[PDB]
Design a binder for this molecule. Structure first.
Ligand code: ZQA
Ligand code: ZQA
Lengths: 412, 412
């Protein structure tokens, strides 16, 4: 029968920090992680900035010899996973290793490595493709390499659901534990799509902000002057654990994961429906899963991508789900500061939602100077808002009309 | 408790055929689908052959315009999915659309598209990258496009577990139905990695057979002269359905899906452990899940990739799990004919396992001329074997030590 699931460990690389506390400090201070990209020449690109991980040292985690075989998205996913496992205090043993698994996903995976090997193939020939090209690039190898390093013999998989990946990964991992397929899961996502194909491909779709002369103001969810998402890099990982397992070992519990929803829009390959119907169906599924009155929801970490259609669809969905209570909760987009970590967005935002519960504060939506028509909820404009939060919801939406919602609450 | 899950629809593209019955006819005749790769200069490559899908007409499924937006692996996944939904007879309605979902995966995703957009980026710059590059290349777009086309509003996601993808996709879709999150799921996988990057990437790891002179003899699982796997393309999709739902509409039921196992080896990034410990745990997990004794297993569709370490690991795992029953079951590798469809392998091999139950026949392992040291099981060498089959297993083992096992049972 269905078991309860708690969060005992969290790990992160973001444009605001090389771990959770440093990232969260930036979040509560309203700091932007967005800046012109230094790692490549983007003069021919319509977008030349994004949220880079600054000063990442893979030799805090892995030997340089191993690191050279792995795409940055794998290095970032392992860094966050190692932080989360360490933060949990969990000891992996012969007695429990079969009951500990991993589900770390990515939206695009090892695009930098595929681009670099494509350059080798086209300029030199196939004999110059790396022997490590496949295992160092494919999405499942965060889960794979983490399992090999820590000896995790539980369910081992990866999701890829575009901008919903981190949320789906965490929800499905919670279901694994709920249904008894595992007692512990490391789950989240990682992304590093800031290569020519990434910036060029999102640019060709005209999906990205082109505010090159003011990158920190580019990401402006629900602002009338928003012009698309800001592409960002990093990773979030959480240690999910069955409640009685966590209690038995005296784990520190950050919060309980009480609800998960999925729904497909079935609307459009890339565009959300303007009325937010799929996001509303997804939140309702999650609230019913959590056994909640919708009025219990205090804080929503929105998807909040800073796209014209996406941001207004989310307002419509929250009004439709929460009715008059939509005016009482606080909703913010931390993408205002981090940008959009794509497959990692739902993982870092789940962490921010848990910390909103720990610290009783709604992170701000920075840059919300002039809320757009109908964007008249409490969007926590400009500055963090201390408030009562018993229940927090984290939403993600993605290409293919794929929706996820996670519901977290305080654990006493 | 848990609901029962049955297979009511199947669909396929393979190197043997453009649907299930044509593919299955090839399988039972011992036909190879392996041939030198056409319309592609492989002069500089150490492998020049593989399993291509021959004569695929995407305009039976999509307009030319919608097809131009999608990588071949998405086209292939959609073709198998549309076939499987047609084969099931299911009528999607306003009353059931929120209960029908999709989980179609891929191991490597849109390499062909990435390669062609790389060509444009390197030659001409980013402004030649296609606007549909990102949504037309990402792995979750088979689930995305299928849900949009058919109006499916249930759980919408995509697995990517390398060579285990199709097995995990089907198993986790079965869990969605068993635990009441959906009544119907379309599940499986698709792959088209026959680009420079795929043949070059696997070639750089020396993982592929280089038997260019005799492509049809290259895939020879458990044969002492095997020299690695054969890269193949295509897709498999199954309609999974809750039993009472299938019975209420008078569905034709092929078989019941009674068990699903997952395990991680935690051993090596590409190589399985010689003793098959991971595969043994995963099969035992799947049999425990099904409430079946190893003695009840009649037929195993092996992973059987034709790699030195993989094939011998599977013999060891089967001897370990089945003890005095290990010789009584029949175990075959259909990859002897199809080659290795990577993330689609588990999907087309779940279908072949279901048809083994329908037709009471074990498909052959062709090319098994000289079984290797210790390969003395009933590997169905050379010719199909009519026999009693009540319980059939399908195994997949992939990069990162990721394992999956499905258990199917006759339904009457
Ligand atoms: C942690 C496992 C690992 C990292 S890089 C690697 C490897 C490289 N060549 C064989 N194996 N294994
Ligand atoms: C406790 C969180 C944390 C910060 S840095 C870190 C780590 C784990 N392994 C190397 N570094 N864990």
């Amino acid at each position: 029968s269905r078991r309860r699931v708690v969060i005992t460990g969290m790990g992160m690389l973001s444009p605001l920090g090389l771990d959770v506390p440093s990232s969260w400090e930036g979040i509560l201070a309203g700091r932007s992680g967005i800046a012109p990209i230094e790692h490549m020449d983007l003069s021919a690109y319509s977008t030349r900035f994004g949220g880079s991980v600054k000063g990442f040292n893979v030799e805090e985690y892995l030997s340089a010899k191993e690191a050279r075989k792995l795409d940055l998205f794998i290095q970032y996913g392992l860094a966050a996973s190692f932080q989360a496992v360490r933060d949990s205090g969990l000891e992996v043993t012969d007695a429990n290793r079969e009951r500990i698994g991993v589900s770390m996903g990515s939206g695009i995976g090892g695009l930098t490595n595929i681009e670099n090997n494509c350059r080798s193939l086209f300029e030199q020939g196939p004999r110059r493709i790396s022997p490590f090209f496949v295992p160092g690039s494919i999405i499942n190898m965060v889960s794979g390499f983490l399992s090999i390093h820590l000896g995790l013999q539980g369910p081992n998989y990866a999701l890829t659901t575009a901008q919903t990946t981190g949320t789906h990964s965490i929800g499905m991992a919670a279901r694994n534990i709920a249904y008894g397929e595992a007692d512990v899961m490391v789950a989240g996502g990682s992304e590093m799509a800031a290569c020519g194909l990434g910036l060029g491909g999102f640019g060709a779709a005209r999906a990205l902000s082109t505010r090159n002369d003011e990158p920190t103001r580019a990401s402006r969810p629900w602002d009338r002057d928003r012009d698309g998402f800001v592409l960002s890099d990093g990773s979030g990982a959480l240690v999910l654990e069955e409640l009685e397992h966590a209690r038995a070992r005296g784990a520190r519990i950050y919060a309980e994961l009480v609800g998960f929803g999925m729904s497909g829009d079935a609307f459009h390959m890339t565009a959300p429906p303007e009325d937010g119907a799929g996001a509303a169906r997804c939140m309702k599924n999650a609230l019913r899963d959590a056994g909640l009155d919708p009025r219990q929801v205090d804080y929503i970490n929105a998807h909040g991508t800073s796209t014209p259609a996406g941001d207004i669809a989310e307002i419509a969905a929250v009004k439709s789900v929460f009715g008059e209570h939509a005016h009482a909760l606080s909703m913010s987009s931390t993408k205002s500061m981090t940008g959009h970590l794509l497959g990692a967005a739902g993982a870092v935002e789940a962490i921010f939602s848990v910390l909103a519960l720990r610290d009783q504060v709604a992170p701000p939506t920075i840059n919300l100077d002039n809320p757009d028509e109908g964007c008249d909820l409490d969007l926590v404009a400009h500055e963090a808002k201390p408030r009562k939060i018993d229940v927090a919801l984290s939403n993600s939406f993605g290409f293919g009309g794929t929706n996820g919602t996670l519901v977290f609450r305080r654990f006493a």
